[PDB]
Amino acid sequence: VLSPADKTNVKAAWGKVGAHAGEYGAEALERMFLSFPTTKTYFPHFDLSHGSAQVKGHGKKVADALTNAVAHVDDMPNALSALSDLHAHKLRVDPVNFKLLSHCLLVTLAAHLPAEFTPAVHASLDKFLASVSTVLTSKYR
Amino acid sequence: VLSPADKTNVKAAWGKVGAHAGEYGAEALERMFLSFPTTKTYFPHFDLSHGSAQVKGHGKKVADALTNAVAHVDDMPNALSALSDLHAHKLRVDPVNFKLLSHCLLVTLAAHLPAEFTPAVHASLDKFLASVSTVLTSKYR
Amino acid sequence: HLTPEEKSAVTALWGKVNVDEVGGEALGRLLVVYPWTQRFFESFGDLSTPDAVMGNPKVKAHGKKVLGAFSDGLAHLDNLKGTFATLSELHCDKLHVDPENFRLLGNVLVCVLAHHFGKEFTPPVQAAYQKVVAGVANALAHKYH
Amino acid sequence: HLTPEEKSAVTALWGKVNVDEVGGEALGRLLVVYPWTQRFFESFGDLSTPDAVMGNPKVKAHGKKVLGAFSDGLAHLDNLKGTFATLSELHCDKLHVDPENFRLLGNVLVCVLAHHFGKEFTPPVQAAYQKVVAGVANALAHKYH
Numbered sequence: 133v134l135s136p137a138d139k140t141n142v143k144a145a146w147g148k149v150g151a152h153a154g155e156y157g158a159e160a161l162e163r164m165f166l167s168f169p170t171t172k173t174y175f176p177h178f179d180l181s182h183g184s185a186q187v188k189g190h191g192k193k194v195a196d197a198l199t200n201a202v203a204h205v206d207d208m209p210n211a212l213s214a215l216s217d218l219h220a221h222k223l224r225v226d227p228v229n230f231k232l233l234s235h236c237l238l239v240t241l242a243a244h245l246p247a248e249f250t251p252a253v254h255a256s257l258d259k260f261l262a263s264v265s266t267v268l269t270s271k272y273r
Numbered sequence: 274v275l276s277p278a279d280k281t282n283v284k285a286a287w288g289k290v291g292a293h294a295g296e297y298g299a300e301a302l303e304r305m306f307l308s309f310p311t312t313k314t315y316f317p318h319f320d321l322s323h324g325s326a327q328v329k330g331h332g333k334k335v336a337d338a339l340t341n342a343v344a345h346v347d348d349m350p351n352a353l354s355a356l357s358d359l360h361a362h363k364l365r366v367d368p369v370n371f372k373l374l375s376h377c378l379l380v381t382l383a384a385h386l387p388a389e390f391t392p393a394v395h396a397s398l399d400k401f402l403a404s405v406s407t408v409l410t411s412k413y414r
Numbered sequence: 415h416l417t418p419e420e421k422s423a424v425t426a427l428w429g430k431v432n433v434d435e436v437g438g439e440a441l442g443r444l445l446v447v448y449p450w451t452q453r454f455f456e457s458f459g460d461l462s463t464p465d466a467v468m469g470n471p472k473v474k475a476h477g478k479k480v481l482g483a484f485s486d487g488l489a490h491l492d493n494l495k496g497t498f499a500t501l502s503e504l505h506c507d508k509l510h511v512d513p514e515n516f517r518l519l520g521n522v523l524v525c526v527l528a529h530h531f532g533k534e535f536t537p538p539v540q541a542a543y544q545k546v547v548a549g550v551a552n553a554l555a556h557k558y559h
Numbered sequence: 560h561l562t563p564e565e566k567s568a569v570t571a572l573w574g575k576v577n578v579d580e581v582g583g584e585a586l587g588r589l590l591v592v593y594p595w596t597q598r599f600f601e602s603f604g605d606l607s608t609p610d611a612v613m614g615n616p617k618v619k620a621h622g623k624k625v626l627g628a629f630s631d632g633l634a635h636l637d638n639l640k641g642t643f644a645t646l647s648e649l650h651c652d653k654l655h656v657d658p659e660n661f662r663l664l665g666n667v668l669v670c671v672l673a674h675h676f677g678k679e680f681t682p683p684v685q686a687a688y689q690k691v692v693a694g695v696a697n698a699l700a701h702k703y704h
């Protein structure tokens with residue numbers, strides 16, 4: 133569960149992401165496909181080359197869901213219900229993959245937030261990404 | 274979550290565990306120590322040899338907690354409040370390990386319940402034990 | 415990986431397996447216990463319920479083929495990497511199958527073997543099979559890139 | 560395995576690393592992000608808040624020896640297992656540390672490398688380090704029985 137200091141931290145860090153969420157989303161995905169090649173088995177339909185439009189478009193959607201999760205941080209199961217359904221019933225990405233993407237998102241933030249990625253914020257973002265993942269797989273079976 | 278069916282399935286298989294819970298916990302633990310050796314790092318204070326007395330006792334303790342959990346399936350977070358505080362604040366077993374004891378608990382059940390370990394029931398038991406594991410690690414950070 | 419007493423006990427137990435029924439039942443249970451795995455088999459028909467899944471002939475037939483290759487792999491316990499290299503490249507480049515499925519199938523197989531042999535699937539025998547299914551998973555995953 | 564270009568990228572980035580500093584920074588952060596890992600350090604004193612961890616002198620002194628051994632291993636990429644053989648034995652037999660800790664520290668370490676180097680820690684540089692940290696970790700878990 134996210135504490136009051138966790139939410140303050142996520143909101144502060146994500147707030148600083150601002151207009152770059154889409155770009156960061158795309159960069160985390162590239163980091164993931166490059167670092168964890170098995171994750172690419174879920175996008176056989178994507179041209180996965182650096183800067184592809186498919187990956188660029190998908191990163192924006194991923195960052196937009198996260199930006200939504202921060203805005204509804206005290207009500208994530210509901211704010212993420214549609215996405216949760218999508219993942220459980222159609223995509224069916226195996227659960228072990230959310231941790232891989234979550235790690236690449238933290239790495240992407242670290243890389244971009246020299247001042248804000250303090251030990252404390254890093255701890256909170258990890259809990260947050262872990263919580264978004266749990267909601268997204270909560271209806272798997 | 275656990276459906277009303279998963280609960281009916283869990284109660285029935287576990288009901289059939291009878292006064293055998295101690296032996297099956299001990300068995301589940303012995304299977305886990307032998308199959309996944311890294312789990313022994315958490316019991317450098319137990320004699321871990323076959324037929325070991327501490328293993329037999331801990332096995333009973335683990336079984337009885339599940340028996341309490343089955344009886345309180347609708348409200349596990351609460352029934353297990355104290356045991357989750359214990360794993361989160363003192364024992365601090367790494368979360369990767371709960372999936373290993375759970376697997377071993379299923380192998381144990383299957384090996385002892387040929388009649389009741391149907392595909393559906395195997396499904397429910399798996400959901401139950403992961404749900405228990407989730408409660409047990411919910412207060413970790 | 416396996417000690418010689420482990421290699422022996424595995425061969426020993428395998429030779430009593432009906433690979434056809436165990437493969438059908440394992441893949442069947444995989445689709446039932448971890449439903450998201452059904453994603454690769456929408457063309458198999460009815461997978462709506464557990465008996466529909468366990469009863470499905472395409473599930474049963476694919477199970478037999480898959481456990482057959484696995485079984486053939488048990489004659490390559492010294493170089494599983496080499497024996498599955500082609501199947502590994504195939505599952506990655508062609509089937510786009512996430513390797514975690516090979517580990518999930520591994521544990522379902524262990525539960526099936528336990529369910530079938532009862533007492534005979536001893537903690538030590540299981541430990542040996544945990545090494546094998548983990549080796550076959552890694553070997554199958556070895557070529558993904 | 561790492562490609563000759565990955566080894567180069569790794570060694571070159573590591574040449575810029577203050578090992579004592581990264582060591583204190585990665586151990587501290589492991590203890591803050593995954594607080595249950597503090598279970599092995601009751602003797603380090605106050606670990607109650609993030610600053611109490613990051614600034615604890617025993618945590619800093621320990622990060623130094625940890626990343627120092629890690630740093631040495633980097634000069635032995637073709638033989639991580641033998642390089643870490645005696646520390647594997649020690650972490651298992653004497654400290655009783657679950658190997659999953661080595662993988663959690665590997666990821667925190669990658670996060671600290673990205674935070675320090677910013678854009679310079681490129682996705683291809685990260686993939687190279689992911690293989691290194693997974694390698695160290697497998698090397699440190701190898702002697703466990």
Ligand code: HEM
Pocket residue numbers: 171174175190193194197198215218219223225229230231233234264265268
């Ligand atoms: C941070 C966790 C994640 C979030 C917030 C999330 C979010 C999204 C969103 C918003 C969509 C777009 C839905 C739409 O088009 O309406 C989506 C689709 C999808 N996601 Fe997830 N996702 C996450 C993790 C994962 C992971 C771990 C993978 C696989 C490694 C995955 C695989 C996919 C794929 C295959 C699609 C379909 C994309 C396409 O064909 O365009 N997702 N996800």
Ligand code: HEM
Pocket residue numbers: 312315316331334335338339356360364366370371372374375405406409
């Ligand atoms: C199915 C999940 C689990 C259940 C229901 C369970 C149950 C219990 C119970 C009832 C106690 C006894 C505490 C007391 O006497 O007050 C306990 C102790 C303990 N558990 Fe957990 N546990 C689970 C998983 C784990 C895992 C996965 C590990 C390790 C791999 C673990 C390791 C420990 C240790 C080392 C103790 C201390 C035992 C001693 O000092 O004798 N537990 N657990």
Ligand code: HEM
Pocket residue numbers: 444451454455476479480481483484501504505509511515516519520550554
């Ligand atoms: C346990 C290790 C496994 C082995 C030994 C194995 C082996 C095989 C073999 C023999 C083939 C046919 C290859 C050919 O065309 O010659 C195949 C195809 C296939 N396998 Fe795997 N497999 C394994 C596990 C899995 C799992 C767990 C899934 C996913 C739930 C899976 C999904 C597929 C798919 C979809 C195909 C093609 C299906 C079709 O065309 O009808 N495999 N496998």
Ligand code: HEM
Pocket residue numbers: 596597599600602624625626628629646649650654656660661664695699
């Ligand atoms: C890259 C991985 C790691 C390396 C290279 C490493 C290396 C070291 C070194 C060189 C020593 C001193 C050995 C001695 O005292 O003779 C040590 C001690 C120790 N390590 Fe590790 N370590 C690793 C990660 C871990 C992690 C992840 C933790 C646990 C969260 C851990 C827990 C300990 C503990 C409890 C000690 C003893 C501390 C004391 O003296 O009180 N290590 N390690």
Ligand SMILES: O=C(O)[C@@H](COP(=O)(O)O)OP(=O)(O)O
Pocket residue numbers: 552697
């Ligand atoms: O066999 C070994 O000594 C190593 C080599 O391969 P990696 O550790 O790099 O996978 O591990 P294993 O083949 O069991 O996975």
